[PDB]
Amino acid sequence: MTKLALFVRLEAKPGQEAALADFLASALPLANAESGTTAWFALKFGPSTFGVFDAFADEAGRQAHLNGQIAAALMANAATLLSSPPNIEKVELLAAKLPAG
Amino acid sequence: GHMTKLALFVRLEAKPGQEAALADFLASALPLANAESGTTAWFALKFGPSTFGVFDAFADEAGRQAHLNGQIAAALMANAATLLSSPPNIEKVELLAAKLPAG
Numbered sequence: 001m002t003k004l005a006l007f008v009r010l011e012a013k014p015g016q017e018a019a020l021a022d023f024l025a026s027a028l029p030l031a032n033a034e035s036g037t038t039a040w041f042a043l044k045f046g047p048s049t050f051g052v053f054d055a056f057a058d059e060a061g062r063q064a065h066l067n068g069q070i071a072a073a074l075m076a077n078a079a080t081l082l083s084s085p086p087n088i089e090k091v092e093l094l095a096a097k098l099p100a101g
Numbered sequence: 102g103h104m105t106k107l108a109l110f111v112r113l114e115a116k117p118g119q120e121a122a123l124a125d126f127l128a129s130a131l132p133l134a135n136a137e138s139g140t141t142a143w144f145a146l147k148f149g150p151s152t153f154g155v156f157d158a159f160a161d162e163a164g165r166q167a168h169l170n171g172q173i174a175a176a177l178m179a180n181a182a183t184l185l186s187s188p189p190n191i192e193k194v195e196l197l198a199a200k201l202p203a204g
Contacts, residue, residue, distance in 0.1 A: 099141065
């Protein structure tokens with residue numbers, strides 16, 4: 001079972017809403033490449049408010065994601081894309097249902 | 102898969118003294134989620150001492166609505182006053198992209 005997760009809410013700068021949505025959608029292959037990243041979701045709450053939820057078997061998986069390509073790419077573009085600094089929330093998974101793979 | 106497109110992001114605030122009870126409630130709800138054929142992924146969340154949640158994902162509106170009207174929602178509604186300091190905060194979410202294990 002997946003036991004650990006991360007959640008981040010992301011607010012787009014005026015004029016960078018498409019750019020942020022496209023960035024998040026484009027990261028899917030990067031998430032598929034991360035074997036320790038069990039599940040990964042690019043979220044849209046509203047026209048300028050986006051986010052990511054992802055899930056891991058263990059802390060090694062979670063840290064590998066934070067040290068990985070998607071987190072890197074987001075940090076490299078954050079100042080361009082985002083209107084406020086995002087808080088990456090650590091989450092404990094109390095239970096999870098996923099397809100078996 | 103690109104085929105899961107909708108989600109809910111729910112925050113739940115535990116009543117003081119009820120934090121363990123809410124965590125336990127959520128964990129015991131797993132079999133109920135497992136049985137929901139339209140609920141592709143379902144995660145019971147703990148953010149902090151008294152702050153919990155659910156993130157769940159669906160192929161379509163029918164699956165999302167079946168969850169909102171399902172056994173977990175009913176159980177939480179039956180016990181809401183015992184466990185929660187305010188009503189669930191439920192956000193409808195669109196998925197731009199999603200990785201799940203296959204199946």
